[PDB]
Symmetry: D2
Subunit: 302 residues, 4 copies
């Protein structure tokens, strides 16, 4: 009864597997009585579906009481496209999309409205920076704009198409990284840039969507977590691995950051306990954000 989402329905954009923050959020949302629908990137939908029906993810679905998480729908969704006229021929051609239709944001909204009705909870757990491993001086207009398009406009588009089907008192969460506010070497490709805009837009949307639909809009700035999208930067030992160590050694709380930690925080920002909370960037990072200085620097002593 302190968090109780029975009755409510949630849509979680960006779940391809059990290793990202999206999975964890969906897991907790569901754990609280909500109906949870996923939006899944089409090229990877096939393998995800397999994973689920094979019983290969039955461990990662175990809710505290042994029950397994049901998903009330798993929708093809490419949040780089707002509507049909936007999808290139080479994508409709592309083998990997071959099989499913109705995967633009406008179309997924429409599918969800009539399959499930109005929703309560909207989760944006997805980014894509083609040139993430390039520093800004080496990132191209096209790679920068793609990172913006995939990782920030995607959120605005989602709100634009889901807010009309969202109940008054609904809530929406997205996910940033500290790079948005402060320099993080290695996080390139205009991703820092895009996250900064994701944060700005979390504020503007909180306003526009607060007034138009009474729907809250918040962000979590989250610490490093070895998701599959995170392992692919530098694709040996790599961006995320060093990120995890740096935070272990320098954060106020010395502990492993678990995907569920963001899961819990998301649950709060999407629950009635947060009815007065909007426009916020909430740090879920063991407190790393609060430091002005490394405590494991070579430039002092151990």
């Amino acid at each position: 009864f302190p968090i109780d989402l029975r009755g409510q329905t949630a849509f979680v954009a960006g779940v391809a597997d059990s290793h990202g923050y999206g999975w964890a959020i969906a897991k907790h949302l569901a754990s609280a009585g909500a109906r949870v629908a996923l939006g899944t990137w089409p090229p990877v939908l096939g393998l995800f579906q397999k994973s689920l029906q094979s019983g290969r993810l039955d461990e990662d679905r175990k809710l505290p009481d042994g029950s397994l998480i049901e998903f009330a729908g798993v929708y093809p969704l490419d949040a780089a496209f707002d509507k049909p006229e936007d999808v290139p021929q080479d994508i409709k051609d592309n083998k990997r999309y071959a099989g499913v239709d109705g995967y633009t944001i406008k179309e997924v909204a429409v599918k969800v409205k009539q399959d499930l009705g109005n929703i309560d909870i909207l989760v944006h757990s997805l980014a894509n920076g083609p040139e993430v491993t390039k520093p800004l001086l080496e990132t191209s207009r096209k790679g920068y704009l793609a990172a913006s398009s995939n990782s920030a406009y995607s959120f605005v588009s989602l709100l634009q198409h889901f807010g009309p089907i969202m109940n008054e008192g609904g809530s929406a969460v997205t996910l940033s990284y500290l790079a948005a506010e402060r320099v993080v070497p290695g996080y390139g490709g205009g991703m820092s840039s895009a996250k900064a805009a994701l944060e700005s837009d979390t504020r503007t949307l909180a306003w526009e969507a607060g007034q138009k639909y009474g729907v809250r809009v918040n962000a979590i700035s989250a610490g490093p977590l070895k998701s599959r999208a995170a392992s692919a930067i530098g694709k040996e030992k790599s961006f995320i691995d060093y990120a995890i160590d740096y935070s272990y050694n320098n954060a106020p709380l010395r502990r492993d950051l678990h995907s569920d930690d963001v899961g819990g925080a998301a649950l709060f920002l999407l629950s009635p306990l947060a009815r007065a909370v909007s426009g916020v960037t909430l740090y879920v990072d063991n407190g790393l954000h609060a430091m002005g200085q490394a405590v494991d620097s070579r430039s002092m002593p151990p």
Copy 2:
């Protein structure tokens, strides 16, 4: 769900049912915490009687239909750390007659004695004698008092409770936006002392996080007509706070009445295992007012 059974909390700065302290206490209990309270001695008697009568039973009802009961109500003056710090005027002050052992060190001891190690600590108190005065008209004695009562109190409170706090425990305090941007009428260096409070939340989140594995956070709240807010500007007319609430209602993303429960629940989260990777933050619980860079109802502006 979130489950605080087995856990004990001390909420400091509870004298009535109208405070953010009350609402927080009411939410820790409804999640199954044991809740002991801290109450400024001058008003302890009138508070004890309010509970004991039954006047607060409306305000005491939890979701399950039962009634919050407290596990001890401690006299507490957060302006004092030790009994040597209490001056003669207060020892022999008529408002403080009957009450004993209310300095921070002593309360922390009796709380250890009577209850054992706590898990949760709330700092929900403030006081600045010259709050009505702008900063250009505020004195060293009163500004320093504002810092003493509203900022340092949180430092001492952590210092003296930290040791009796379980690994993975939480402390949270309460600020107002004025700490980051100017809110007129929020005077007496309360603005100053809330910025200090926020800074200390970060610094202590480090210190207490490294030493005790305790989390430390701050909720920056929006306007609420609590007893203390009513006292600001006091005549008997539409006060500082009335205008704050009106302004927020008219300029916040969410057009809404902020209720003490709204913070109750925001805090509940912060003091719960759901927040175990959250520390050192300033969580705006203000209907989104903080995010605005411009009032919408300005007279420069059309409706």
Copy 3:
């Protein structure tokens, strides 16, 4: 005093005498810089004629009674990096007839050719086709355009000028408050793209600071009725910008008319050896509006 003799600057985004770009140029020159300009090709002709006629000579007078002369006025489209990026419609666009070599790579080359390594770089341009539209009514094509023209342009500009910039050189860009807090009517994802711009200032201050020992800063400006600001909301009536200026005048610490010189001089500092330990900052040049947490002239509120 501060002395820019021997130094050369390229100020990008100058088509009239009403812009913040103009005022900055006018201040670099009055400190004895050589100032070459960047001008969007569609308006280059009308700009060249304005200077050449003598219509701007009022706007051209420096403190010493003389007249700013420019060391070359380059056609520049910051939406394009290379001549392969320019599409056929623009190649054969009537507004672009006569002008050649205006992509960022090419301008940086001719600037190297004609003048050598520069010391100072100003980014004073923005464009977002759907600026009148709130974000909930903004398109991917237009939001992306806003980022392309107003944010990435600064990245490319540094990328392509960095190499021809002297150790200890400066670049500065221009933002608006909306990047941090909501300013209604500032739409089309201009808000979004200014936040990106500010973030990149920090990231590039690192990157360019480590590689070139170049500084990189951002002035967050207050409202000014420049040509581009007048175009926002355009009917023929009291516009978005008129209300911005009124609001600021009524709610800023300093009750004052913000003039383009106010930024001219703030920037001058940032691009001068006085600022050699300053990099990655967002300097509010806004009569102190940014510091406020509440409008004073709200209709919730009494005069």
Copy 4:
């Protein structure tokens, strides 16, 4: 002519020697045509006076053109006291104060008004944390309150007593440190705390003083500099020495931070070039503020 302060008069609180930021600010202000008066802590006034008349500081006074800096007055000033009734008997007793009167903020304001007239420029370059080397968990009410009183209220009091004698369009600068916003280990004793309040009050004063006198109010957050007050923390190799290294190795600009660097920045914030600038915290720190991560951490590689 780009900065030209001839005619104007400045008062610089907190100059005891040629090694602090106060000296540098005063040096540049004077360098620009201003009359510059100093407020100097009484216990150290004697030695300072000596230093100046002995010709021992004639190097540090050399302005670019070889001319030497004149000071239009050097006032006893203990900014822990607002007015005569506030000074304890043991301080009036104290040998070190024995010799000079009129050293409270109210009295120095009054002395300056009639010796020099109305002023234009006010500089607050002073702090004192009795327990700076103690972390916050170990700092006492008294030490915390003293750090607040010395380093933050001091500024409010100065504005309170100088603003009445300040010309419209005047300007005022104080000096913070990054500890105010983000955790810096070693900077204890409630100094972080006080600086946070110094920043808050720079904003509130910009408002109160903007409206009441048309006087601007700004802060510089400055990087580490081996002033004499800075050498006394840890009083061997110590807080400031490590601070200087950490910033050398981790800041966007890899260069020595010189007292003049803050001097220049101060000059700007106190000049007509800043007439639209108020309420600001201006970072003069080689860009250290902008980083979210050390680049010399043990937790990666070199």
